[PDB]
C-alpha cells in the first residue's frame, strides 16, 4: 500500500531513464505525503522541471530545489515541517532521506544515497528507498564533482505517480 513515485531523468535536455521509488508511507506518513504530493503537482507546485543541484560522487545526489540552487523549496504544508521520526535509517545506495537546515526544517529538498551515509542518522528523516532504476542514478552521479557542482544539467523532465 506504500505509494511508488517516478522521475524521468534529463542530462542536458536529453532523456537518461526512469528512476522509481517506495515511500514508507506506513513508516512516516506526513514526510512520505509532501513527497508524493510535490511528485504529482497536484497542489500546483512540485518537482517536474526541477534540477539536481548538487552531486557529490561516492556520496549522494540532492535536488528539490523548485530557486533551483539548494536556498530554496517548500513543503506542501505552508511552511517547513518537523522531522517526522528517525525509525529509518541511512543504510546504503539508493536511501532516499529529507535535506534540511537544521531540526524541524523540512521543506522540499531530498537527496538519493550512493553509499551508506550513517553519520546522518537521527538528523535527516528517511522516508522512501529506489525501487527500480538505481542504475539511472549511478548514471546520474558521474556528472557531479567533490565539490558538488554538476558538469551537466540534470533535470526532472517529469515525475509522478505509479501503480
Not at 513543503?75 to 536511501?95: C, Q, R, W
Amino acid at each position: 500500500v506504500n505509494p511508488t513515485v517516478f522521475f524521468d531523468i534529463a542530462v542536458d535536455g536529453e532523456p537518461l531513464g526512469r528512476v522509481s521509488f517506495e515511500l514508507f508511507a506506513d513508516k512516516v506518513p506526513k514526510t512520505a505525503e509532501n513527497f508524493r504530493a510535490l511528485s504529482t503537482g497536484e497542489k500546483g507546485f512540485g518537482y517536474k522541471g526541477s534540477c539536481f543541484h548538487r552531486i557529490i560522487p561516492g556520496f549522494m545526489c540532492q535536488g528539490g530545489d523548485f530557486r533551483h540552487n539548494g536556498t530554496g523549496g517548500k513543503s506542501i504544508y505552508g511552511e517547513k515541517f518537523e522531522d517526522e521520526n528517525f525509525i529509518l535509517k541511512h543504510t546504503g545506495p539508493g536511501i532516499l532521506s529529507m535535506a534540511n537546515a537544521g531540526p524541524n526544517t523540512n521543506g522540499s529538498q531530498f537527496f538519493i544515497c550512493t553509499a551508506k551515509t550513517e553519520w546522518l542518522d537521527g538528523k535527516h528523516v528517511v522516508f522512501g528507498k529506489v525501487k527500480e532504476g538505481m542504475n539511472i542514478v549511478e548514471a546520474m552521479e558521474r556528472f557531479g564533482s567533490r565539490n558538488g557542482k554538476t558538469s551537466k544539467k540534470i533535470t526532472i523532465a517529469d515525475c509522478g505517480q505509479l501503480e
